[PDB]
């Protein structure tokens, strides 16, 4: 999904709000902040109501202005709440009744997702690959800065995982794929407009193809 969450390479942001080794305070800065993750885990591990991938996607589905003005942990309160409503476990009415006011949720999905591709390639360390020049309106674990770009395999994972584009919509056809650490030169991704060396992106097999 080409959402506002796909931030890498966006220009116009200011200073990162940290100097090295500065005190970051306690893990949680408010008494509610442990709830989103704890309740995500109740959903995923205790109830089996949704996957972690579905949490990533439902946050991506926040209305864009809403995403941009919402602090991190609050996004996950909104996301987990959304998924519990979509899955029929909770209603928006009961959340607003208990909250004492408005509890706007993430927007509905505009895509049904896609299956894990049946046609893929097992790549080896050192091989040159291109990131498939595809547009996926639902969930995908490919940041747009690498779409269509060529890099080299640094690592093939020794485990396999469900294809996010499927399991992030709760589909039954996510399969399993290894991922690849793909090293791109900074200039391949941003031309002359970068100060870096290389960027390594961890990409699912199904996002890759051999380089020309």
């Amino acid at each position: 999904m080409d959402g506002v969450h796909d931030l890498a390479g966006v220009q116009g942001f200011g200073k990162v709000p940290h100097t090295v080794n500065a005190d970051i305070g306690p893990t949680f800065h408010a008494e509610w902040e442990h709830l989103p993750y704890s309740l995500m885990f109740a959903g995923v591990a205790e109830l089996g109501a949704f996957s972690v991938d579905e949490v990533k996607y439902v946050v991506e589905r926040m209305e864009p202005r809403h995403y941009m003005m919402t602090p991190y942990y609050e996004r996950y309160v909104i996301g987990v709440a959304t998924l519990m409503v979509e899955k029929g476990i909770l209603t928006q009415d009961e959340l607003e009744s208990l909250a004492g006011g408005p509890f706007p949720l993430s927007r509905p999905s505009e895509s049904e997702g896609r299956p894990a591709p049946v046609e893929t390639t097992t790549f080896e360390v050192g091989q040159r690959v291109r990131v498939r020049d595809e547009y996926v309106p639902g969930h995908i674990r490919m940041p747009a800065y690498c779409r269509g770009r060529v890099g080299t395999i640094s690592h093939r994972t020794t485990e396999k995982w469900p294809f996010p584009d499927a399991i992030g919509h709760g589909r039954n056809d996510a399969g399993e794929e290894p991922t690849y650490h793909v090293k791109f030169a900074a200039e391949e991704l941003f031309g002359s407009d970068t100060d870096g060396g290389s960027v390594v992106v961890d990409l699912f097999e199904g996002y890759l193809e051999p380089a020309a």
Binding site: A8, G9, T27, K56, F103, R141, D195
Partner: protein, 192 residues
């Protein structure tokens, strides 16, 4: 228009808890895990071991998962580990441009700044400037390599061991390997 976030968060809890969907002690357990167990002190232990034990260093860099599992530090959002080695010509730095992905059990939960739009947008494109702004000058003769945590691999940086620490104990070395060193934005510092 929105109700206070505290009210929304506790409404979500109460809604689920009142349906019997949240086990007794469940969120409080996770809070304890998040606050007390998941910690960059674990990553610092791993780094100090690698610095003092060439055999373990080799293991950590070839099969990070196995190395971490020896200490019992595998966990949620930290099941498949890769450690990435700084060298005299290479500085590694970790981000999750899409959200916040972090090796929780060994780095701790990510700090506010790592989840910031500023870090997520900028470090992939201008890592040298971002590190500089943060207080870390990377010599012009060093490649920066940004790892974007886009799948299930969870990373930790193995920083270079600084001079002036020869012969230190593992406990001593642990002390100078900070969270920011593990993420890759800081270089371990030796007092005088």
């Amino acid at each position: 228009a929105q109700a206070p976030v505290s009210d929304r968060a506790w409404a979500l809890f109460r809604a689920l808890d009142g349906k019997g969907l949240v086990p007794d002690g469940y969120v409080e357990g996770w809070k304890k895990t998040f606050e007390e167990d998941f910690s960059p002190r674990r990553g610092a232990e791993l780094v100090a071991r690698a610095w003092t034990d060439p055999e373990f260093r080799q293991l950590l860099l070839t099969d990070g998962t196995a190395a971490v599992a020896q200490y019992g530090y595998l966990g949620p959002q930290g099941e498949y580990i890769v450690a990435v080695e700084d060298t005299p010509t290479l500085k590694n730095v970790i981000v999750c441009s899409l959200c916040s992905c972090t090796a929780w059990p060994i780095l701790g939960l990510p700090p506010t700044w790592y989840k910031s739009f500023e870090y997520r947008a900028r470090v992939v494109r201008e890592p040298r400037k971002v590190l500089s702004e943060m207080g870390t000058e990377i010599a012009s003769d060093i490649e920066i390599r940004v790892y974007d945590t886009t799948a299930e691999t969870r990373y930790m940086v193995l920083p270079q061991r600084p001079a002036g620490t020869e012969g230190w104990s593992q406990e001593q070395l642990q002390e100078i390997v900070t969270k920011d060193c593990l993420i890759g934005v800081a270089i371990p510092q030796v007092p005088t």
